[PDB]
Curated annotation (Swiss-Prot), chains A, D:
Impact noted for substituting residue 11 to T: In strain: Omicron/BQ.1.1, Omicron/XBB.1.5, Omicron/EG.5.1
Protein name: Spike protein S1
Effect seen on changing residue 140 to V: Increased resistance to neutralizing antibodies
UniProt region (Immunodominant HLA epitope recognized by the CD8+), positions on chain: 113-121
Reported impact of residue 125 to K: In strain: Omicron/BA.2.75, Omicron/BQ.1.1, Omicron/XBB.1.5, Omicron/EG.5.1
Mutagenesis or variant effect for residue 149 to Q: In strain: Kappa/B.1.617.1
Effect of residue 117 to R: Increased resistance to neutralizing antibodies. Decreases HLA binding to NF9 epitope. Increased binding affinity to human ACE2
Effect noted on mutating residue 118 to F: Decreased HLA binding to NF9 epitope. Increased binding affinity to human ACE2
Region Receptor-binding domain (RBD), annotated ranges: 1-183
Effect in UniProt of substituting residue 4 to D: In strain: Omicron/BA.1, Omicron/BA.2, Omicron/BA.2.12.1, Omicron/BA.4, Omicron/BA.5, Omicron/BQ.1.1
Species for this entry: Severe acute respiratory syndrome coronavirus 2
Mutagenesis / variant outcome for changing residue 8 to Q: Reduced viral infectivity
BetaCoV S1-CTD domain sequence ranges: 1-183
UniProtKB/Swiss-Prot annotation, chains B, C:
Effect ascribed to mutating residue 21 to A: Strongly inhibits interaction with SARS-CoV spike glycoprotein
Official protein name in the record: Angiotensin-converting enzyme 2
GO CC, any one term: brush border membrane
UniProt keyword Transmembrane present: yes
Membrane topology annotation: Single-pass type I membrane protein
Length: 183, 711, 711, 183
């Protein structure tokens, strides 16, 4: 309902932690969107194009984050990859639909941007619509590590690095998804 | 276990990307604009990458290798677990580095100056190459060929004599037998069950594939000799070899500067579309656009849209310090650039294709892990680049793009001209490469002592290549160390395998595009099967054994030579006709100086009984000085001149155990002058008694063959 | 008749003014601002003046000279009727010019490089002067002193040997006996009846006035030797001469670089007003203003008001190519300028006075005809300039202008310091000048053949100056041709007469200003009789015989030496006291190498009867090579080393008619190393039979003095 | 009477030929002159300063030319010199009085001025207030010359040459004299 604003902000969140925004009691018809000039990906499965003009105003949410270009394939249901079992998980049935767009001028300082992180290591895959923020040393193998971070144990959060001269697949992209449900 | 190696690689792959990116950006920023803060901004970034790589190398040793079954991580760890030169002591590394630096600077800044006017000295690149590649004067070329070696080669003898030993130690500390067996470690694979290759097999493959090129090289040699017998009369015999200073440069690596003396039809100029590129107003951009269009035609992708603004295609307007050597840069993270100063000639028109080949190869394996982004071996990256420039400069393709009017027709004389101009550069450099690498291997392994280097060198030169020296070089010179690759510690075998891979690829691709004529008119434009065959091999990289990647294109397992012979047939059937009268081959006994020499034979026991001294080299010194004194006295007391001969104007050859050798004399400071045999005979007839008394020999122990005693 | 000569001069005087003015303006405009159009704008203007002068010279011969009685027009015509070098044939002039140019360039751009690292060569001005004037290492100085001669002097021998002859011809075609008698033609006058001077009298005056300086030079020499015996121990004997490479530069012209080793009181710094010239904020203008005020004080005119804006007093702000060597320019037509880049030190404070002296001299005779605006002879122009800088740097005058606080007092130790620092430069250069000019005269006239130059040179060096050479130089070197004045064809006698005229003028002027103390504290400021005495001589020029112009100041007719001795008395009475123990004088038999040499004596007739060959220099070559071989064999068979001696590591000295000489040996490429006598004795004991057999001598004809045969 | 103008002109004449200007029927008192700032030489013998206010208006003349600086000594009566017997002659008795002043900005081109000449050679000295303009070759000695100008015979008119950097004695000076007589 103020989503016309959420597409217009100053900074997003990382992938290991995102924003949960509720929307309710409104009138939105979803025609001013889906038809613009700054879009690049509008992938929807549960509702057809121009079919989201029915009973919809029941417990809708928004969530926004940033990834790099050659990763948007991992978001869609199925399609196992790197960040599909460790940072964000999305089941097969209940997907509202996905939207994403390039943002290289809002980010990518010439020197290098390190305001974004993402998880790399975990003991098991994430369950649908889960989250985690804990930061503990990763016990790889069979040996007790405690803070040492020397060998067989390291920190699981790493930075991206964004420069203005990278390729089309290494530039930052912002993404938001929708969640359409029924009472 | 494997999980640990997988995670370790997962972390290394994420650090190396950024570290390498910054390291390369520094060097690009320096090379594009030379200043005095860029070097300091680049050196530290390079040192950081070196330090990180060494640390991770020494860390990766905690994993035993013989437990891994995934071939990919096996190859990655094998490429990371290497040790390098950081295995010797510390002071040994210091000594080696000092030796290498000294050799590099000695090669870079040596000088020779004229004996007439000793105030003008010349360097190697500006001026000596000019004298050697432009002149037509026998004496000037002889002076230039002799002085470079005599003044610079000697300085490099006692350094090389240590370099060898140290490198051998550094090799034997790594489970290799010597350094040559360390250099042959790229054409090696293990455990594919049908695709193996050992280190000792490369030698036999090279020696067995070379012996089928001799029938063509012999005819080319005979023709070039019969054509040189006209520009230097009375200096070349019709059944001997070629003197080493008449080839076209300081060493004879390429013969491509003899073309002006060897055109088969000098009244038929070859194709050169240069005025058509200035009457049609072609600027820099259009050339690269046409190159991109050609590459698109075969079924390969476009450019990256970041390649058009980030690159630097033409020389800066302001006179700006920026080295310009046309190169292709793969910085990383989907960034590709080109660096050159594009003039407007057909030369740069072909160089553009040759350089864009590297970029089109680099854009293909960018989906592999970090450590596996190279070529299959040393020969692929340049062959893939050159088969494009080979197929871009044909008359058909040149007339289709719009640079040649359709009124142009083809005459077979121009065909022969083109084929010979290509042969003089392709076939002329195989014997030299084979000989040099063979000599280096035999020296490194130990089959040649430290007192037979410059004898085996000049025997292998006459036996294989067919080239003789003009002045006898004793065991103090060092001729193979006056070349860029030998004194700067580089390998030399890739230049031999690339030339075979090139023609193999060409014949394999010209069969998918349905060619019908000769192999040197072929073209791969407007094709879609050739492009797919090539892209099915570009995308592999080092993640597969090279002997399998070679089969995905041709359909064989080893390098072959017959495709190179099918390319040069219409020249063979013409040389075989032109060499009907001349003598095909050469004899290894002639010499450019073996008709003004005298032979000396000494018998010690017969004269001195059981008191004869032993004949070391100090006696040779005494003999040379005595002959010099005799020449002085003869000139003074007959010709009424005062010339100052010395003990270095007497040249000696063919020393044997029963003391017997040849010698001859030379003017004081003019190497291309020779005192004839008759004057030396007269001068020795006059002072024989003193030469005899100096040694205690009695006219029957010391024999000059040809001078009969009468008094 | 005289009217015609008068009118001819009346026209020449009106043309020469403008032609010379433009010629000089061109050169000023070039020197002030270096470019590539100024040289072309200047060369043609110079050529025009040369051509006009030659034409008028060849025209002025139409007047017989012996009819004229007016002395002025006689002198003018005599100065214009000269012929110069345009009397030989044409090709002879071409040959002479080519020889002169070749010698000039050979001197300008010669090089020597280190035997250790042969890739670094040094020139004469930057670097060789530095090594010779700064070092304190015996071996480095020996290397530098030997290599310059051995590499450059030799190239200049066969050119000089022709130069002499040609110049002699050019002199004898002009009614002179030789070239020396042509150079002595300035101190010559005729027909004044009481003021005559011939060409042969200068020689006797020089030789008779030199012999009164020896008692002071000997004491100075002995003191300098006794002080050098501390900085180079065990290299200088206390009764011998001084080795030639320890003096202070490449030749030993000035001794002024030994001062740091020879201060009498090293804890008492001398007067240097430099910080007072930066704490008082003195810029360029104030120095020249003070100079002008000093010159005004004595009764001489002001400046020209066109001198202040047209001149160029300081270096241009922009980095502008403009050579800066402080000079004074007299352009003509009442124009005078100065050229220098004035820093702020006392050095430039004195140079300003020295340069303004020339301008004040030039402003004085500007009322004479054009051809008579010079000095009286070669010695006046610089002596008049230097007697000002002599009297401007006293403590009295320095304290009166305001650069030294009145609290400053005088101690006699500072007096001795100053006097010795002046003596080391004034007296140290008289023997060298006398010797050089004497040698050149004797060579030109013919009293020395072409095979005794470098023997008489090194005998006159020990006999007069007192300096010995460190290495024997045979008849192939050329030592006197490695000096700027000998190879660039300049005269050298003026540097001897100027030094006497200077002190004569000073003592003559310090008597009109009523001085009372020692002669070296004198001052001529605030005077009016000295100024008038000087101006009564400046205004003459060449219009009078110099021997009369000299009398209008001093009151004598010839150059004298006693004023120079009265200036140096308080140093004489101190050196005579300090040299009480040491030996005053030197002996001409010592040598720095005559204790490691061996003497050889040969007797031919006694051995060979009436068959003995004659002993030319080829036999010397054979002997040297034989000794080198013997040394080689000894080292190899005893010390187990491999050293390569040669026939140029055996030095030979003192050849005599009954064959007998001395010799010694030297390491291969290290001139400052000497194989001791004992090792040479051992090496010759071992191989004497072969040396004997090589010559047919029998141990009684070939004697090494000191080695007794036992077997 | 217009002499206040003759001191203010554009060009003067040389020394071998000058201008002859008559002045009459006027009132001039000669006080505005003799007192200025651009003068350098005012030498008068026949009439004292401020004594030229008597019967004067009878046949007065003006004449102007240029010389170099170190020559004005030759103008005054007596004082024999170079240009006192060949270009201009002035007797001892009848001199009105002499005036001269520097002019270096009105003349002396940077390259060189050759608009002025002067005689050098003649067979006898000039008589009081004489003139000559003839230009014939000078027969020096005893030999017939006709146009040849080779030897013993040459042209008697030469140029000066004026540059802006010469000394105080080599710069151009303008001069005018007065002639005071009685009827």
């Amino acid at each position: 309902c103020p989503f016309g604003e959420v597409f217009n902000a100053t900074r997003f969140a990382s992938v290991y932690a995102w924003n949960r925004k509720r929307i309710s009691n409104c009138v939105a018809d979803y025609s001013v969107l889906y038809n613009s000039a700054s879009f690049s990906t509008f992938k929807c499965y549960g509702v057809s194009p121009t079919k989201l003009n029915d009973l919809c105003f029941t417990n809708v949410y928004a969530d926004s984050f940033v990834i790099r270009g050659d990763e948007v394939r991992q978001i869609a249901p199925g399609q196992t990859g790197k960040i599909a079992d460790y940072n964000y998980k999305l089941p097969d049935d209940f997907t509202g639909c996905v939207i994403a767009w390039n943002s290289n001028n809002l980010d990518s300082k010439v020197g290098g941007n390190y305001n974004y992180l993402y998880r790399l290591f975990r003991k098991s895959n994430l369950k649908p619509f889960e989250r985690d923020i804990s930061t503990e040393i990763y016990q790889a193998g069979s040996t007790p590590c405690n803070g040492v971070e020397g060998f067989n144990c390291y920190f699981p959060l790493q930075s991206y690095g964004f420069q203005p001269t990278n390729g089309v697949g290494y530039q930052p992209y912002r993404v938001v998804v929708l969640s359409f449900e029924l009472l | 276990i494997e999980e640990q190696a997988k995670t370790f690689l997962d972390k290394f792959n994420h650090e190396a990307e950024d570290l390498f990116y910054q390291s390369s950006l520094a060097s690009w920023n320096y090379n594009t604009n030379i200043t005095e803060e860029n070097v300091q901004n680049m050196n530290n970034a390079g040192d950081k990458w070196s330090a990180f790589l060494k640390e991770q190398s020494t860390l990766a040793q905690m994993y035993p290798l013989q437990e891994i079954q995934n071939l990919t991580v096996k190859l990655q760890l094998q490429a990371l677990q290497q040790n390098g030169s950081s295995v010797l002591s510390e002071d040994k590394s210091k000594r080696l580095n000092t030796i290498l630096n000294t050799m590099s600077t000695i090669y870079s800044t040596g000088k020779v100056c004229n004996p007439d006017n000793p105030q003008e000295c010349l360097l190697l690149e500006p001026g000596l190459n000019e004298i050697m590649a432009n002149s037509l004067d026998y004496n000037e070329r002889l002076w230039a060929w002799e002085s470079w070696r005599s003044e610079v080669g000697k300085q490099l003898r006692p350094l090389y004599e240590e370099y060898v030993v140290l490198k051998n130690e550094m090799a034997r500390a790594n489970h290799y037998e010597d350094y040559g067996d360390y250099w042959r470690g790229d054409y090696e694979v293990n455990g594919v069950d049908g695709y193996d290759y050992s280190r000792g097999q490369l030698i036999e493959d090279v020696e067995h594939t070379f012996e089928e090129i001799k029938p063509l090289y012999e005819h080319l040699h005979a023709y070039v000799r019969a054509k040189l017998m006209n520009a230097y009369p009375s200096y070349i015999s019709p059944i001997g070899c070629l003197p080493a200073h008449l080839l076209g440069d300081m060493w004879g690596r390429f013969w491509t500067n003899l073309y002006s003396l060897t055109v088969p039809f000098g009244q038929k100029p070859n194709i050169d579309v240069t005025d058509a590129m200035v009457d049609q107003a072609w600027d820099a951009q259009r050339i690269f656009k046409e190159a991109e269009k050609f590459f698109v035609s075969v079924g390969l992708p476009n450019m990256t849209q970041g390649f058009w603004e980030n690159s630097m295609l033409t020389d800066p307007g302001n006179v700006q310090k920026a080295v310009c050597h046309p190169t292709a840069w793969d910085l990383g993270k989907g960034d590709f650039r080109i660096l050159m100063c594009t003039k407007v000639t057909m030369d740069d028109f072909l160089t553009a294709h040759h350089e864009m080949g590297h970029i089109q190869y680099d854009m293909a394996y960018a989906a592999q892990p970090f450590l596996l982004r190279n070529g299959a071996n040393e020969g692929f990256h340049e062959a893939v680049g050159e088969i494009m420039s080979l197929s871009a400069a044909t008359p058909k393709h040149l007339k289709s793009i719009g640079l040649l009017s359709p009124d142009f027709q083809e005459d077979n004389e121009t065909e022969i001209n083109f084929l010979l101009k290509q042969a003089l550069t392709i076939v002329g450099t195989l014997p030299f490469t084979y000989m040099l690498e063979k000599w280096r291997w035999m020296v490194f392994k130990g089959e040649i002592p430290k007192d037979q280097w410059m004898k085996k060198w000049w025997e292998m030169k006459r036996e294989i290549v067919g080239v003789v020296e003009p002045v006898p070089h004793d065991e103090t010179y060092c001729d193979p160390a006056s070349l860029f690759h030998v004194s700067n510690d580089y390998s030399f075998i890739r230049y031999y395998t690339r030339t075979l891979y090139q023609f193999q690829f060409q014949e394999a691709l010209c069969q998918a595009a349905k060619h019908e004529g000769p192999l040197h008119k072929c073209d791969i434009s407007n094709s879609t099967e050739a492009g797919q065959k090539l892209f099915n091999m570009l995308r592999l990289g080092k993640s597969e054994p090279w002997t399998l990647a070679l089969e995905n294109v041709v359909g064989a397992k080893n390098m072959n030579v017959r495709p190179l012979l099918n390319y040069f047939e219409p020249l063979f059937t013409w040389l075989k006709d032109q060499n009907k009268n001349s003598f095909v081959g050469w004899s290894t006994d002639w010499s450019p100086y073996a008709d003004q020499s005298i032979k000396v034979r000494i018998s010690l026991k017969s004269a001195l009984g059981d008191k004869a001294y032993e004949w070391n080299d100090n006696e040779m010194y005494l003999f040379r000085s005595s002959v010099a004194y005799a020449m002085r006295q003869y000139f003074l007391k007959v010709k009424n001149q005062m010339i100052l001969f010395g003990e270095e104007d007497v040249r000696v050859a063919n020393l044997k155990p029963r003391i017997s050798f040849n010698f001859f004399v030379t003017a004081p400071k003019n190497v291309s002058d020779i005192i004839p045999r008759t004057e030396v005979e007269k001068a020795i007839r006059m002072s024989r008694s003193r030469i005899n008394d100096a040694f205690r020999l009695n006219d029957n122990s010391l024999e000059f063959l040809g001078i009969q005693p009468t008094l």
